[PDB]
Subunit: 143 residues, 6 copies
């Protein structure tokens, strides 16, 4: 790992529902990973970067309104103009019964439930590379 893991953490609201049955779409995870990758790029070379693509993405468990979610990302490799990262999505809390709209019961996921994994890469043009912006990334280096 280059630098530190970045962790996003937030709640799926009703506004994150996408398909019927309060089901959140898998792209909601990819949305967040885009922002996680962005934060990694700000720290490693001071640019918001452009996302190049994903080698793979697996959606491993469904996500619903009322789920509290964490999104983890870290840099595995610093290339020339590319940076290769790994990503995870974890569910840390949920409604007890999503099928009952009037049920307010909720609980923690112990252990958290893996909802997604990915490998993806981001781009910062050489002339946009400004060096580390955050202390845990001070030792990052290009080949």
């Amino acid at each position: 790992m280059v630098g530190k893991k970045v962790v996003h953490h937030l709640m799926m609201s009703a506004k994150d529902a996408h398909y019927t049955g309060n089901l959140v779409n898998g792209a909601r995870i990819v949305n967040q990973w885009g922002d996680v990758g962005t934060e990694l790029m700000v720290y490693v070379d001071g640019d918001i970067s452009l996302f190049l693509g994903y080698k793979d993405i697996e959606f491993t468990a469904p996500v619903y309104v009322g789920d509290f979610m964490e999104y983890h990302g870290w840099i595995e490799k610093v290339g020339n103009q590319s940076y290769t990262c790994k990503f995870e999505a974890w569910k840390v809390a949920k409604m007890v019964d999503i099928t009952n709209p009037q049920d307010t019961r909720a609980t923690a996921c112990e252990p958290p439930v893996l909802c997604g994994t990915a490998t993806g890469s981001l781009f910062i043009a050489k002339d946009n590379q400004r060096g580390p912006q955050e202390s845990s990334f001070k030792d990052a280096k290009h080949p």
Copy 2:
């Protein structure tokens, strides 16, 4: 190909901007691909399905507010409970100068600009497979 190509077509509005500079995030393409994938699954087996994952997503050109975009998807292979699909994203029109907010000029992209490509797979549990629901998919078959 099994069945027909599904084509989504719409505009990026200011609401689709994500990063600064009116830059739309890559995940917006993935969002649309989720819906294209859903339509394919509705037609092939009558269920909105669950997205399993992607292989080799590439974001090949930046997308901005005011871009008109098409998203193509089709079923390459029908598995047991999985369906493997190909996806594309195409830009067909754009603002001439996104850096000038008061500039209202826009033009077509001839030829269209390729903005995204991916392979993705969706899942329908055997008990939820209801057979083709759209005429062009009528001859789809599982192994």
Copy 3:
């Protein structure tokens, strides 16, 4: 018509629900027609234009979360600074039972269902008229 038909095609997600019961509002159709009209104006004279208004709008069938929708528009006539257009909205797929949130069943609409029609006009100031921008519109002419 002047030029070619513009066709938008997308899904109503949970985010498009407006009234209770997963009912989409009629204005969602008008939103899309605005973007269809914009695209037509980009092609006929290279400007995003200003919508002048609608002579008539009819909402002919209800639209729900999970509906796949098409929106058609074309130019009927080119005026001096105004362009008169016709619009349609069609439902091509839907959930089987929107009243059951856990029902994942969906199907095509065969035949498609008419959901709306309209006549509306858009405006491009004379000095903003840049001529056709797309090959099918090459013969578009002002009086």
Copy 4:
């Protein structure tokens, strides 16, 4: 007029921008009128109703981020299952210079600037008509 005029009043935020240049789409006005029509129908017969269509929607002045807007609606004629309503949209305040994002100056529109008008009709099936729900509509009468 039957009953009272219903007045919605709110601000266009950055989230209401639709086209480039912080321009709000005309459909934002129609979105609001749909909710105004709904409120009138709640008051006259106790149902959220269904919008039948519009005549003569006219967008008469542009609307931008930072505009404060009022939307007026009222019932002009009570029919059998239809209700004919009039709608207005008024700008009551605005940014002084929308072209300068760092300019925080804003002022009132005195007199208010007319931004839209329409005639629209709504439908409540006879078996869903429950009579007036709001005191000012107490004497509304069907033929």
Copy 5:
């Protein structure tokens, strides 16, 4: 009190749901009060201002999809660079039964139901103060 009361008035749509059970979050009220405060600041000194904070906020009744809501605000005191305002939120109509998605019955709240109150302050830098912009605020003066 200085000037006139500002009244925003709109509908809670499905898009305003936040928690399960079509429950709107308290922050939706605070969102609206921010815009009410902004409008007051435009009228009293011609600047959109910056919100300083809230002395207190109380959420007194729950708000649901299909509720029609008013948000009142007024200037209690003009200070030097600060302005002390009072806010209320009122429910004026609602669905008859939110637990039944397909139910279209709705009614007015007579009298309206108090849903929230707050005291909050806004800031306009001395050099950004431009004097009253709306006639009812003509006697609004700084000490």
Copy 6:
């Protein structure tokens, strides 16, 4: 403190802009604190709870598109049916120059910038209290 601190962490996208100049509204912070408070209530007693109100919200620094933000919350006191919590908002990264939309430079905030503080209380009806749901909260007790 009762239990542990909950930390939400995410990015302000263009979708979070509210006023002109890419300025996020103060209520965006309150929105997040509502979700932070919900998480706390889920862990302490297994219910999403209702927010009672706030005392002394202060917005201490402005927030813009492109800001990465953290929102901390914790339980200070467990009451009978109320829970009193402290909330903070922290800026951990930002665009270098928000006034140039095409500038992609970004940096960390070291140290983080305090953007908001508040005390807020939430409510869980006695019969809805189900005991701690997350190990760090296991010893939380009512009077």
